[PDB]
Design a protein around this ligand. Structure first.
Ligand SMILES: CCCCCCCC/C=C\CCCCCCCC(=O)O[C@H](COC(=O)CCCCCCCCCCCCCCC)COP(=O)(O)OC[C@@H](O)CO
Ligand SMILES: [Ca+2]
Ligand SMILES: [Ca+2]
Ligand SMILES: [Mg+2]
Lengths: 33, 245, 443, 238, 82
C-alpha cells in the first residue's frame, strides 16, 4: 500500500515538474517570436 | 434509553408475579437496548418484543413519552452537533506570488463582475491571487462561482472589523485592500459610514497597506482625507462614484 | 461628564478615578513595557476605615501628614479631602487585608451659596460666533467641546460639564474658557439651562470641519472633548461611535504652522470595541479589557461601562458616593441638592463673609517637573521623598505619577502619550520628564 | 526564481479543476470511472465473500486494476494540489481511496479476492456536485442543492447497504463466523430502505451482533437524514 | 426604434452606445484598472472635472468651500491644459 502510494506520488510530481520545465523554456526562449 | 432498557430486561426476565413467573422470555440486556431503540424510533421490526403483561403495559405507557422525546431530541442533537464554521482557517502566504484582499459588499453579481474584469485574458500574464473576507457565508451560487476559480480565489468567513480576521488573511503581505460598496442602497450616508469604519479598522491594524475603495458621496471622501494614514503619495485611492458620474 | 471635566482640569484623572473603584488583583508581567508599571497602579482600590486612638490626640491634621511611611498606605466627622490647616479615613490601599493597619497599629459674582460662579443670563444671539470673529478672538489654554446632534437627537445635558470647571477656588482670571462647536439647533434646545453660565461661546457648524476647528484655536486648547447624542438612535454595532472616531482622527491629522497628534483630546465611546480605532501605534485585541487599552490608560478615552462597578463599592460603605460628588462636579452640598430640586435652575445672590468662607476646598491640578524648587527630586530615584517633601513643605499630597509611555526605554522617542500611575511604591524611580497630580488648596 | 514546488502545486490545481481541456477530460474520466467502479462492485457482490481468481484469466480484475490505478493517479494529483496535507488526509475521498486501492493491489498480488470494504466506492459518488460545478454545467443554486442532496442520499444509502451486506455475510469474528445470514446485496438495499423509512416490515433484518449494533447506530443518523432529504428533494424537483 | 432584450449587456444597448445614457454600474470596473497601475485614477481626475491639482484637494479639505483671489502671472500660466 504505502510503497505504491509513494510511487504514484513521485510519478505525479516528476510529471508535473517535467511539464512545467518544458512549458517554461518553450515560452521564455521564444518570447520575441 | 438505558433506564427503559433495564426495566424491560428486568420485567421480561422476571415474569409477572400473578402467573408464577412462568413467562421468562430470556432477553439479554443488549437485546432489550435494541428493542427500545427500535420501538421509540417508530420502525418496529417485531422480531423482538415484550410478551409479559407488565412488559406490554410499560411499552404502552412508554411509547407516548418516548416517541415524542426521540423525535424532539435526535434532530435537535444533530443540529447542535452540526454547528461549525465551514469557511474558517487562515491564508498561507505563498512566496513569489502577491495576493490582495477584497472585502465590503460581497454579492454573487458584484463578485462575478470583479472576477471577470480582474482575471480577463486581455491583461498581461500576471499571477495575483484574490482573497475574499465577508461576514455572511456564501450561498450555493457564490460557492459554485468560487469553484470555477479554484486555483485563483479563496474565501475566509470573518469580520473586517476584527483585528484577528485581518491577521487571518495576512494583510501584512497583502499587496492591496479592496472595499466594494453597495451603490443601490437606501441610505448612502449609512453605507459611507460603515465603509469609513472598515477604512479605519484596516488602517488601525496596518497603516502601510494601500486601499482602493468606492465612495457614494464627496463629503465622505473628504472625510477620508482626515484619516491619519491616508498616504495617497506612494499609493491610495478613493473612487467617488457620484463625482465621477 | 464630571470625570470628563476632571480630565480637562488635569489629564488622566478620569482613568485613575475609574480604576480606583474597580476591584483588581495584583498582576505581574515578565517583559518590561509600559503596562508593567501601569498594572501596579490599578491594583489600588478606594476603601473606608476608621482611625486609631494614637491619631486622636492633640490634632487630627498634623498627624495625618508624613505618617504614610510607617503605615505604607495613603490617606485622602464630615467629608475630608487633604485635611490641612471618630473620623473615617478614605484610603487608597491595594487590598482590604492590609487596610487594617491604621486603627489596629498603635506603635452676584458667586452663586447662592458660594460653591460655584454665577453671572447675568445671556441670550443665544449674544454668544453665537462665526469663523471671522472666532479666529479674531484670542483663545489659549481654553476648553473646546465638540457636540454631535440632530433635530431628533437625544438630550445629553451640558450643565454637568461646565459646573466642575467653575469651582470656588477657581478665580475669574484662572477660569478656563469653554467653547461649544456643533449644530446650533441642539445648543438652542439645551439653551434653556445653558444661559446663566459665564465665559461660554458657541460656534455653529460641525466638528468634522477643519476650518471651524482652526477658528477656535484648537492647537493651543487645554482639552478637546468629543461627545455624541445620536448614538441612541442607531442600533447598529458597527456604526455606533463610527462617529466620534473620525473627529478624533481629524484632530490628530491636522497640521499647524506642527502636527496635532499631540493635542490633548478625550473621546467618549458608547461601544468599548471601537477604542482600538483611537490609536494606531498600539496592539488591538478584542480579548483584552478596556482598562488595559492604551488610549484609556492615557486618559484620552472614557466609557460609561467602567462606572458599573460603582454600585458594588457604594453598597459596602455609602460614604464613597458623596466623596465622589465632592471630588468631581465641584461639590454637592446638601443645600444645593434642595435648591436644584425646587427651582431646577441655578441662581445666585450677594456674597456674605460666610459665603466667601466656603472656599477652603482643595481641587485637583497638574504640576510639571522640569522647572521648580523641587527639581532636585526630578531624578532622585525615590518617589517617596517627593511626596514626603510635598507634604512637609507646601502641604500637598500626590495621587501618583503621570508617566510617558516610552520613558521606560533607554533610547529617546517622539511619543507624547502619558499613562497614569496611582500610589507608586516608596522605592519608585523617577524621571525628569513627568507630571504630578495634586490637590491644590485655595489662596 | 519563483518557486518550483509552487509551480507544480499550481499545475496540479489547474489540472484538478476543469480550467483546461486536459482538466475537463480528467474530470469526466473520474466521473465515468467512479460510475464504473460502482457497477463493478455491484456485479462482484454476487460472488462469495472470499474466492480465488486468476488475474490474467479474468476479465473483471484487470478492469478493476486499471480503475484503481487511475484513482491512485488522481489521488496523487489531488495531494500535490492540496493546501493542508493533514486535513486532506482526513477527507472522505482520501479515506475511500486508502481503503479501496491497496486491498485490490493485494488481491491481485495474492490471486485471492475478498469482498471487504469495497462498498466504500459508493462514497466516491458523493464528489459529483463538485465535478459538475468544475465543468460549469451546474450553475443555479436550486440545481446545485438538488444534486448535492441526491448524491449524499444515494451514497449514504448504498454505503450502509454494502456495510450491512458485508457484516451479515461475514459473521462476527468472536462467534467463529457462524452467523452467515446469506443476504443478497439487493436484499440489504431493501432492508436499509425500509429501516430508514421507519416502516419496518421485519421480514428482513440484521441478526448478527455487529449488524444489530450498526443498525442501532445508523437509525439515529439515517431517520433524520431521510425525513429531511426526501421531502426537500421532492420540493426542489417540483 | 431598437431591439430590447434583457439578456444583452448595457454597453451593447443603443442609447448607451450613443452617449444618451449613463449608469454608475459601468464604473465598477474602475477598481480593477486602478489596482494594476494607479496612475489612471489621477489621469481620470485630470481628464474630467477640469483638474484635481494636489493643492486643490487640500484647499477643499480645509475650508470645504471654493474661494478665489487676485491672479498672478503664474496663475495665468496654469492654463496650458488641453
Ligand atoms: C506512507 C503513506 C503516504 C505518506 C505521505 C507523506 C507525505 C510527506 C509529508 O508528510 O510531507 C508533506 C509535504 O510534502 C512535500 O512538501 C513534498 C511532497 C511529496 C512528499 C513525498 C515524500 C515521500 C517520502 C517520504 C519519506 C519516506 C516515508 C516512508 C506534508 O507537509 P506538511 O505536513 O508540512 O504540510 C502542511 C501544509 O499546510 C503545507 O502547505
Ligand atoms: Ca488590589
Ligand atoms: Ca489600534
Ligand atoms: Mg490558492
Amino acid at each position: 500500500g504505502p510503497a505504491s502510494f509513494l510511487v504514484s506520488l513521485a510519478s505525479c510530481l516528476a510529471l508535473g515538474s517535467g511539464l512545467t520545465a518544458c512549458r517554461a523554456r518553450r515560452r521564455r526562449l521564444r518570447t520575441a517570436a | 434509553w438505558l433506564t427503559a432498557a433495564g426495566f424491560i430486561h428486568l420485567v421480561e426476565n422476571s415474569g409477572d408475579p400473578w402467573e408464577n413467573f412462568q413467562n421468562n422470555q430470556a432477553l439479554t440486556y443488549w437485546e432489550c437496548v435494541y428493542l427500545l431503540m427500535v420501538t421509540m424510533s417508530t420502525v418496529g421490526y417485531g422480531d423482538v418484543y415484550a410478551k409479559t403483561t407488565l412488559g406490554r403495559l410499560f411499552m404502552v405507557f412508554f411509547i407516548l413519552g418516548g416517541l415524542a422525546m426521540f423525535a424532539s431530541y435526535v434532530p435537535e442533537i444533530i443540529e447542535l452537533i452540526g454547528n461549525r464554521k465551514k469557511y474558517g482557517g487562515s491564508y498561507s502566504a505563498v512566496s513569489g506570488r502577491k495576493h490582495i484582499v477584497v472585502c465590503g459588499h460581497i454579492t454573487l453579481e458584484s463578485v462575478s463582475n470583479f472576477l471577470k474584469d480582474f482575471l480577463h485574458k486581455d491583461r498581461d500574464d500576471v499571477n495575483v491571487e484574490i482573497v475574499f473576507l465577508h461576514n455572511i457565508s456564501p450561498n450555493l451560487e457564490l460557492e459554485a462561482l468560487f469553484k470555477r476559480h479554484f486555483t485563483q480565489v479563496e474565501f475566509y468567513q470573518g469580520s473586517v472589523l476584527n483585528p484577528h480576521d485581518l491577521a487571518r488573511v495576512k494583510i501584512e503581505s497583502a499587496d492591496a485592500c479592496l472595499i466594494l460598496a453597495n451603490k443601490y442602497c437606501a441610505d448612502p450616508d449609512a453605507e459611507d459610514a460603515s465603509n469609513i469604519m472598515r477604512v479605519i479598522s484596516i488602517k488601525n491594524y496596518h497603516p502601510k497597506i494601500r486601499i482602493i475603495t468606492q465612495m457614494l458621496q464627496y463629503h465622505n471622501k473628504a472625510h477620508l482625507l482626515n484619516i491619519p494614514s491616508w498616504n495617497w503619495k506612494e499609493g491610495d485611492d478613493a473612487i467617488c462614484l457620484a463625482e465621477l458620474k | 461628564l464630571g470625570f470628563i471635566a476632571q480630565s480637562c482640569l488635569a489629564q488622566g484623572l478620569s482613568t485613575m478615578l475609574a480604576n480606583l473603584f474597580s476591584m483588581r488583583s495584583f498582576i505581574k508581567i515578565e517583559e518590561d513595557t509600559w503596562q508593567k508599571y501601569y498594572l501596579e497602579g490599578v491594583s489600588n482600590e478606594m476603601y473606608t476605615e476608621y482611625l486609631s486612638s494614637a491619631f486622636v490626640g492633640l490634632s487630627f491634621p498634623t498627624v495625618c501628614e508624613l505618617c504614610f511611611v510607617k503605615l505604607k498606605l495613603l490617606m485622602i466627622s464630615r467629608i475630608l479631602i487633604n485635611p490641612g490647616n471618630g473620623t473615617l479615613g478614605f484610603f487608597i490601599a491595594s487590598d482590604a487585608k492590609e487596610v487594617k493597619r491604621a486603627f489596629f497599629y498603635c506603635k452676584k459674582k458667586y452663586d447662592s451659596t458660594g460653591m460655584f460662579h454665577w453671572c447675568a443670563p445671556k441670550e443665544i444671539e449674544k454668544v453665537i460666533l462665526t469663523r471671522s470673529e472666532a479666529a479674531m478672538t484670542v483663545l489659549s489654554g481654553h476648553v473646546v467641546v465638540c457636540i454631535f446632534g440632530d433635530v431628533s437627537s437625544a438630550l445629553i445635558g451640558l450643565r454637568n460639564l461646565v459646573m466642575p470647571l467653575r469651582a470656588s477656588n477657581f478665580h475669574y482670571h484662572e477660569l478656563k474658557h469653554i467653547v461649544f462647536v456643533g449644530s446650533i439647533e441642539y445648543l438652542k434646545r439645551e439653551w434653556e439651562t445653558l444661559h446663566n453660565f459665564p465665559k461660554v461661546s458657541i460656534l455653529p457648524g460641525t466638528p468634522l470641519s477643519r476650518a471651524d476647528l482652526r477658528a477656535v484655536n484648537i492647537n493651543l486648547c487645554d482639552m478637546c472633548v468629543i461627545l455624541s447624542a445620536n448614538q441612541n438612535n442607531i442600533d447598529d454595532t458597527s456604526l455606533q461611535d463610527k462617529e466620534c472616531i473620525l473627529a478624533s482622527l481629524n484632530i490628530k491629522s491636522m497640521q499647524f504652522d506642527t502636527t496635532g497628534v499631540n493635542i490633548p483630546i478625550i473621546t467618549e465611546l458608547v461601544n468599548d470595541t471601537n477604542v482600538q480605532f483611537l490609536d494606531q501605534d498600539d496592539d488591538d485585541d478584542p480579548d483584552t479589557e478596556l482598562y488595559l487599552t492604551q488610549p484609556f490608560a492615557c486618559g484620552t478615552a472614557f466609557a460609561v461601562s467602567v462606572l458599573d462597578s460603582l454600585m458594588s463599592a457604594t453598597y459596602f460603605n455609602d460614604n464613597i458616593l458623596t466623596l465622589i460628588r465632592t471630588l468631581v462636579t465641584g461639590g454637592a452640598t446638601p443645600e444645593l441638592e434642595a435648591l436644584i430640586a425646587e427651582e431646577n435652575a441655578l441662581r445666585g445672590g450677594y456674597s456674605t463673609p460666610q459665603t466667601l468662607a466656603n472656599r477652603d476646598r482643595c481641587r485637583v491640578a497638574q504640576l510639571a517637573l522640569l522647572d521648580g524648587p523641587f527639581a532636585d527630586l526630578g531624578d532622585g530615584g525615590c518617589y517617596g521623598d517627593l511626596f514626603c517633601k510635598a507634604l512637609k513643605t507646601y502641604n500637598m499630597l500626590c495621587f501618583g505619577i503621570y508617566r510617558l509611555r516610552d520613558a521606560h526605554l533607554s533610547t529617546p522617542s517622539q511619543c507624547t502619550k502619558r499613562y497614569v500611575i496611582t500610589n507608586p511604591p516608596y522605592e519608585f524611580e523617577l524621571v525628569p520628564t513627568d507630571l504630578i497630580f495634586c490637590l491644590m488648596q485655595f489662596d | 526564481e519563483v518557486g518550483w514546488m509552487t509551480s507544480v502545486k499550481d499545475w496540479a490545481g489547474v489540472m484538478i479543476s476543469a480550467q483546461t481541456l486536459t482538466g475537463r477530460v480528467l474530470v469526466v474520466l473520474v466521473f465515468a470511472l467512479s460510475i464504473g467502479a460502482l457497477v463493478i462492485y455491484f456485479i462482484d457482490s454476487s460472488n462469495p465473500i472470499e474466492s480465488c481468481q486468476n488475474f490474467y484469466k479474468d476479465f473483471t480484475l484487470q478492469i478493476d486494476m486499471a480503475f484503481n490505478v487511475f484513482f491512485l493517479l488522481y489521488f496523487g494529483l489531488r495531494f500535490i494540489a492540496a493546501n493542508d496535507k493533514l486535513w486532506f488526509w482526513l477527507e472522505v475521498n482520501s479515506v475511500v481511496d486508502f481503503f479501496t486501492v491497496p486491498p485490490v493491489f493485494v488481491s491481485v498480488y495474492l490471486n485471492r479476492s475478498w469482498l471487504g470494504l469495497r462498498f466504500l466506492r459508493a462514497l466516491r459518488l458523493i464528489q459529483f456536485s463538485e465535478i459538475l460545478q468544475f465543468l460549469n454545467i451546474l450553475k443555479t443554486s436550486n440545481s446545485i442543492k438538488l444534486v448535492n442532496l441526491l448524491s449524499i442520499f444515494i451514497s449514504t444509502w448504498l454505503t450502509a447497504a454494502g456495510f450491512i451486506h458485508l457484516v451479515e455475510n461475514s459473521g462476527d469474528p468472536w462467534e467463529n463466523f457462524q452467523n452467515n445470514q446469506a443476504l443478497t446485496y439487493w436484499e440489504c438495499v431493501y432492508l436499509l430502505m425500509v429501516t430508514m423509512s421507519t416502516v419496518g416490515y421485519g421480514d428482513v433484518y440484521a441478526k448478527t451482533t455487529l449488524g444489530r449494533l450498526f443498525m442501532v447506530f445508523f437509525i439515529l443518523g439515517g431517520l433524520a437524514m431521510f425525513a429531511s432529504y426526501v421531502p426537500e428533494i421532492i420540493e426542489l424537483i417540483g
